[PDB]
């Protein structure tokens, strides 16, 4: 005999199976391996997630570029006029800004940084960060994603569903990353070209 | 004499490889990460409400096992189970 009735509500509430202790911190996303920041867009800690957990993938590392194309120019000095600066040949030693002007005058040899173009450079990069950083989806009740016993057919299909999602997302993320990397490298050197043209024009 | 102005861009003594579509490998100044691979290593409270069975399955808690019965009339955001939990009062299927 039931000794009464259990009141049912409908909520974001779920279950999770783990052996990590309860602690005191501020972070939303919670996994069997533990609480992580939900800040970056991807993780590879676990399929099972809860809350605003960034999408799970299969990859180890998918590095995203935030600067222009590095051309280390470690060659024997040619004593060339100024520094023989080129869009191709790199310019080691310019902490201020991302773009600079090197001049060889009568007075001597000198450099001066720009702020205008480089500010627009970093600006567009900073957006690209934000459009891919801190943005998240919340997932409140998944189906189970690990199986201690094999009941059979049903279990088989959600293993399929799981692998489906991870594979699709993995490839999907892989492309997203690569497309942006190209975009940034394009935008950086294009702005180099744009500044280049501005001078010549 | 005659002046020469000559343009160019900055670089870094130490850079990092990045995977693209144009070239599977390339060196750029400053890299970052898009994949958080690391945990603190514990279920941390703020901002969600947590509740740990610490020896009782949710079914065991919903039914009443005298030991670890404190979960009676207790609410949560996310309930967690320990893999060391078990029925220890009466069996059921």
């Amino acid at each position: 005999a039931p000794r009464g009735y259990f009141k049912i509500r409908s909520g974001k509430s779920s279950i999770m199976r783990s052996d990590a202790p309860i602690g005191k911190c501020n972070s939303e996303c919670i996994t069997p391996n533990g609480s992580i920041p939900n800040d970056k867009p991807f993780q590879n800690v676990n399929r099972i997630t809860y809350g605003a957990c960034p999408r799970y993938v299969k990859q180890s590392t998918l590095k995203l570029a935030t600067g222009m194309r590095n051309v280390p120019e470690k060659q024997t000095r040619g004593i060339f006029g100024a520094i023989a600066g080129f869009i191709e040949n790199g310019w080691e030693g310019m902490v201020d800004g991302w773009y600079g002007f090197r001049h060889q005058n009568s007075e001597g040899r000198g450099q001066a940084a720009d702020l205008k173009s480089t500010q627009a450079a970093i600006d567009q990069i900073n957006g690209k960060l934000n459009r891919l950083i801190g943005k998240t989806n919340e997932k409140f009740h998944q189906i189970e994603k690990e199986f201690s016993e094999v009941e059979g057919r049903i279990q088989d299909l959600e293993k399929y569903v799981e692998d489906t999602k991870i594979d699709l997302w993995s490839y999907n993320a892989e492309l997203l990353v690569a497309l942006e990397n190209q975009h940034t490298i394009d935008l950086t050197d294009s702005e180099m070209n744009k500044l280049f043209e501005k001078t010549k024009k | 004499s005659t002046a020469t102005l000559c343009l160019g861009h900055h670089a870094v003594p130490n850079g990092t490889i990045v995977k693209t579509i144009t070239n599977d490998q390339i060196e750029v100044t400053n890299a970052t990460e898009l994949v958080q691979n690391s945990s603190i290593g514990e279920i941390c409270d703020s901002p969600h409400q947590i509740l740990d069975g610490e020896n009782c399955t949710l079914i065991d808690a919903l039914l009443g096992d005298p030991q670890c019965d404190g979960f009676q009339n207790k609410k949560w955001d996310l309930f967690v189970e320990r893999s060391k939990a078990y029925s220890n009062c009466f069996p059921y299927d």
Partner: antibody, heavy 122, light 108 residues
Framework: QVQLQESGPGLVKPSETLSLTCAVSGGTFSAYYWGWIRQPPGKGLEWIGSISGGSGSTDYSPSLKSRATISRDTSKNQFSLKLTSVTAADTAVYYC???????????????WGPGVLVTVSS | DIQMTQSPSSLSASVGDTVTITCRASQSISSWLAWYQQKPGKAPKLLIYKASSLQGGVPSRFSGSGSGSDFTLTISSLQSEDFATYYCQQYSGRPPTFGQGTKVEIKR
């Protein structure tokens, strides 16, 4: 990134030559300019002079222009200062510093040497 | 050549206090000044440059402004990690010239 190791005898006989060397670690010596800077303890400090860490074209503070002679080496990633006819007062701490490539510019002394004491051996 | 004046010549205040150190020039130099942090008995480190444009490695709390002859460094919040001798250096004219150096301590 960029670190420096200052080397030399912290003692020197009066009215003698001062020979110092500082190290580079990381970056390429060819791609910057480098100077030295002098500070007796608890007083004002002073810029000594700089050299083309790429080419060898140099400058010196007018006061120490004749007295101080700075050098470099492409080979060993090093660079030296040679100071003649030292005074008893010249007793100080020295530094190696990274300067901007431009002959006239800002952001000078971005990085500094660990600091080596130089006492004249009275 | 071009003397660099530093004011106030001495100062102190407590934890979480804002203090201002002012630099003067013999001739008004157009935003060409540098500030430095010198831990006593340690190698002096660069603090700011070019009329205090923001620099990486130096937390936001350190700030300044440049106006020809009127140059001030501000410690926004005083931590114990902030006791040192602060120097204003001019690169507008050669030879370079330096701040006198203000012994700043914490009144705590």
């Amino acid at each position: 990134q960029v670190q420096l190791q200052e080397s030399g005898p912290g003692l020197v006989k009066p009215s003698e030559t001062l020979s110092l060397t500082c190290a580079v670690s990381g970056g390429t010596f060819s791609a910057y300019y480098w100077g030295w800077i002098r500070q007796p303890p608890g007083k004002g400090l002073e810029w000594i002079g700089s050299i083309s860490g790429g080419s060898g074209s140099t400058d010196y503070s007018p006061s120490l222009k004749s007295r101080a002679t700075i050098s470099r080496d492409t080979s060993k990633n090093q660079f030296s200062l040679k100071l003649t006819s030292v005074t008893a007062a010249d007793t100080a701490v020295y530094y190696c510093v990274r300067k901007y490539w431009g002959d006239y510019y800002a952001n000078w002394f971005d990085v500094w040497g660990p600091g080596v004491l130089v006492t004249v051996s009275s | 050549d071009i003397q660099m004046t530093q004011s106030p010549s001495s100062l102190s205040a407590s934890v979480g206090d804002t203090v201002t150190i002012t630099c003067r020039a013999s001739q008004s130099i157009s935003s060409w000044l540098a500030w430095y942090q010198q831990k006593p008995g340690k190698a002096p480190k660069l603090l700011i440059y070019k009329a205090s444009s923001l620099q990486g490695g130096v937390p936001s709390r350190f700030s300044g402004s440049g106006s020809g002859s009127d140059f001030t460094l501000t410690i926004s919040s005083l931590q114990s990690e902030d006791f040192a001798t602060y120097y204003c250096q001019q690169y507008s004219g050669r030879p370079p010239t330096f701040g006198q150096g203000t012994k700043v301590e914490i009144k705590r």
